[PDB]
Amino acid sequence: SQSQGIQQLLQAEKRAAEKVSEARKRKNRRLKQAKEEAQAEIEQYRLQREKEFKAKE
Amino acid sequence: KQFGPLVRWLKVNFSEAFIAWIHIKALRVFVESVLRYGLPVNFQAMLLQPNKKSVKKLREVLHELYKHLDEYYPYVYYKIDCNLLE
Amino acid sequence: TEFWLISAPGEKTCQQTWEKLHAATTKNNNLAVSSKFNIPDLKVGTLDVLVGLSDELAKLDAFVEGVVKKVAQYMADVLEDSKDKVQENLLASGVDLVTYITRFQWDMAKYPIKQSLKNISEIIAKGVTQIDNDLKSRASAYNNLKGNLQNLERKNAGSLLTR
Amino acid sequence: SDADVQKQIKHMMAFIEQEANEKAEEIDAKAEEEFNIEKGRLVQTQRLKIMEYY
Amino acid sequence: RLGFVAGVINRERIPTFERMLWRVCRGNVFLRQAEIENPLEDPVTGDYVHKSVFIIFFQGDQLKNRVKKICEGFRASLYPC
Amino acid sequence: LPILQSHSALLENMHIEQLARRLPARVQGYPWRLAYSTLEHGTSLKTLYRKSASLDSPVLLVIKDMDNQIFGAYATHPFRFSDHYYGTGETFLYTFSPNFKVFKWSGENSYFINGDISSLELGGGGGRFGLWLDADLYHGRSNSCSTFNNDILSKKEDFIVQDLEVWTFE
Numbered sequence: 001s002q003s004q005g006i007q008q009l010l011q012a013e014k015r016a017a018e019k020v021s022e023a024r025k026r027k028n029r030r031l032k033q034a035k036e037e038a039q040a041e042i043e044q045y046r047l048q049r050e051k052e053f054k055a056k057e
Numbered sequence: 058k059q060f061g062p063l064v065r066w067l068k069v070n071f072s073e074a075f076i077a078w079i080h081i082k083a084l085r086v087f088v089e090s091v092l093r094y095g096l097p098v099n100f101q102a103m104l105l106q107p108n109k110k111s112v113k114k115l116r117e118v119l120h121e122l123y124k125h126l127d128e129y130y131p132y133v134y135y136k137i138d139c140n141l142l143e
Numbered sequence: 144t145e146f147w148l149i150s151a152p153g154e155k156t157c158q159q160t161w162e163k164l165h166a167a168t169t170k171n172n173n174l175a176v177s178s179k180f181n182i183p184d185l186k187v188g189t190l191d192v193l194v195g196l197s198d199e200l201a202k203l204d205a206f207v208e209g210v211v212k213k214v215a216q217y218m219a220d221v222l223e224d225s226k227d228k229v230q231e232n233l234l235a236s237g238v239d240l241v242t243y244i245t246r247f248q249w250d251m252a253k254y255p256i257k258q259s260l261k262n263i264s265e266i267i268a269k270g271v272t273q274i275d276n277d278l279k280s281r282a283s284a285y286n287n288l289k290g291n292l293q294n295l296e297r298k299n300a301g302s303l304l305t306r
Numbered sequence: 307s308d309a310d311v312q313k314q315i316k317h318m319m320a321f322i323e324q325e326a327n328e329k330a331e332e333i334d335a336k337a338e339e340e341f342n343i344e345k346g347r348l349v350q351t352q353r354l355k356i357m358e359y360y
Numbered sequence: 361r362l363g364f365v366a367g368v369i370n371r372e373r374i375p376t377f378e379r380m381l382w383r384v385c386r387g388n389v390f391l392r393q394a395e396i397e398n399p400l401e402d403p404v405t406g407d408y409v410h411k412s413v414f415i416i417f418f419q420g421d422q423l424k425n426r427v428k429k430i431c432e433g434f435r436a437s438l439y440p441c
Numbered sequence: 442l443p444i445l446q447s448h449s450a451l452l453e454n455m456h457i458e459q460l461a462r463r464l465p466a467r468v469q470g471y472p473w474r475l476a477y478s479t480l481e482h483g484t485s486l487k488t489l490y491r492k493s494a495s496l497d498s499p500v501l502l503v504i505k506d507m508d509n510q511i512f513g514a515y516a517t518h519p520f521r522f523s524d525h526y527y528g529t530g531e532t533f534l535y536t537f538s539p540n541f542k543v544f545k546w547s548g549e550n551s552y553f554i555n556g557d558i559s560s561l562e563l564g565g566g567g568g569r570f571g572l573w574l575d576a577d578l579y580h581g582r583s584n585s586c587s588t589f590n591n592d593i594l595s596k597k598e599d600f601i602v603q604d605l606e607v608w609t610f611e
Contacts, residue, residue: 001308002392008315009390009417012322013362019326023333030337031344034567038348041568045353049360059288060221063281067218068232070274074211075235077267079247080254081207082148083182084264085200088193090150092386095320101157102182104245105147105168105175115174118167122160123151129383133150139240140144141215142229188328190321190388191420197386317388318417322362325419339526342552342565349568350560354580357599 075141082135089133093126100133146244148180176245183249183256185263196260203268210271213278221285363424364417367431367438371395371412380430381416389427390417415441445472449480451503451511451604459541460501464515465531468499468610476500476519477607479578484605486561486576493607494521499531501608502563504574506581508596509603512536514554514563514572520607521556526565528553534563534571534591544571544591552588564588578602 083102090100107115123132153159165177187193218229235243249256253270254263299306369377374393381389392415399408414436416427431438442461443454450473452460461469475481477492493500496519503513514520517529532553534544546553552565564571564586571591573582581602583594 015326019330023330027337030341034341034345038345042352063221071214071233072235078207095317099153100150101161102180103149104180107175111174122164135148137146189325191422318390345567
């Protein structure tokens with residue numbers, strides 16, 4: 001009897017820890033990717049401004 | 058000039074308030090059904106109009122169909138009264 | 144006239160217990176006129192919210208019953224004559240109480256089933272709160288004209304000593 | 307009644323699974339939102355600075 | 361998050377106590393109980409009472425308040441754990 | 442079709458009718474009340490939110506760029522600060538070019554509006570925003586986003602605001 005209820009309650013806490021912890025790790029990774037891909041687009045916008053300046057010069 | 062608008066407004070307000078009343082009943086039924094049975098849901102929402110001659114025998118048939126599940130009832134139980142107009 | 148709303152599980156699927164029930168409740172005798180009822184699937188979650196909803200929806204049930212019953216009383220108060228027609232004016236969805244109860248449908252346009260139970264509950268509470276605000280307005284509109292006409296009629300009533 | 311205790315255990319296990327999923331879905335919604343916020347935000351923030359230098 | 365409470369009650373109260381915990385939580389509560397190795401002496405009368413320990417499990421502070429309100433209703437003694 | 446506005450606006454009378462021909466029946470034929478204008482109120486996003494966040498109605502957002510092109514959004518909910526994205530399906534972006542063009546919701550995401558102290562933004566698509574505006578109501582951005590499949594709306598994606606307004610149907 002009692003050992004099943006203990007194991008299921010411990011596994012209930014395990015599910016509630018894991019699903020949230022995986023979502024938190026995804027949130028952090030998506031935020032890092034947002035910054036990295038933004039910088040790549042910023043380099044292209046910078047290169048346009050520099051080419052445009054060289055043309056005006 | 059108040060009476061005509063009042064009767065039309067009260068027709069609309071009664072329809073919306075009564076519809077909303079049954080929506081709260083449906084939500085109470087839903088929330089209790091979830092809390093009674095858990096998330097792998099397979100419950101049927103059901104409507105009955107009890108006959109005044111047979112309402113006692115109705116409770117006995119309802120109990121016979123559902124006594125294994127567990128005023129109070131082993132199934133989810135709620136009511137609607139049409140006497141709103143007195 | 145009274146109706147009961149019930150919910151219970153199937154044996155494996157929802158049909159199996161209900162299919163046995165409605166037969167016993169209609170074939171032994173007419174114990175009740177018996178059918179399915181139209182409750183949708185809704186966005187469910189934590190017990191902490193589902194239990195909160197169980198008591199909040201109960202306070203709301205008492206409130207919305209109070210609102211709809213006050214609308215019916217206001218119809219009975221405006222109909223100072225032709226009181227037998229009150230049920231033909233207290234329609235819901237353009238039909239009688241017993242009809243819309245028996246033929247109920249969830250309003251998916253006013254209450255989009257994809258939303259949380261909390262959102263749906265608040266949308267109902269806001270709507271019926273504005274019906275209560277409209278009833279405070281319409282009581283003030285009706286009761287002043289009623290009282291003023293009763294006083295005017297009283298000033299015209301009685302003998303030469305009072306009219 | 308041990309069978310009713312097992313039903314109560316199974317009921318709790320169904321609710322905690324959906325609670326774990328519900329919390330994870332909120333954090334996943336925040337992940338997609340903050341990506342669309344932060345990527346657009348950083349691009350515009352620096353794109354305006356280089357436009358002013360240009 | 362999940363939550364839990366632990367405490368002690370007179371053992372003969374357990375059937376009404378656990379039924380009210382299920383009822384107030386609209387069906388669902390997990391709990392267990394165990395009888396004490398001796399009855400416990402009343403601090404004023406010296407009567408010996410056959411108490412039993414319990415522990416109760418739930419989600420969030422709203423259910424903490426429901427399980428606590430039923431424990432108060434049966435005059436049970438809760439403790440931190 | 443045509444309506445009373447409580448004050449002067451960035452929109453011409455033909456722009457009011459072209460909106461009235463395409464706005465929801467929930468707001469068609471209502472008079473429009475000014476919440477915010479850069480022509481009469483302090484030119485900052487905090488002043489816009491101070492004027493519009495107290496509302497509880499459908500609303501119109503109207504902007505003119507330094508290139509004199511007219512554009513903006515209609516929303517079912519007031520434009521305001523929020524912790525998260527908000528608004529509902531009748532919400533759309535628009536421009537006059539010089540004729541009216543409308544960009545209804547794609548159904549792809551909830552990104553109708555987001556409002557921050559640092560910027561106001563409408564739609565979303567990674568680096569894209571359907572509209573974006575700075576805290577000073579000076580710099581903007583606008584480009585096709587998956588929320589609306591919109592055009593550039595302003596005359597240029599790199600642009601300066603000339604004037605901005607918020608209106609309510611009441």
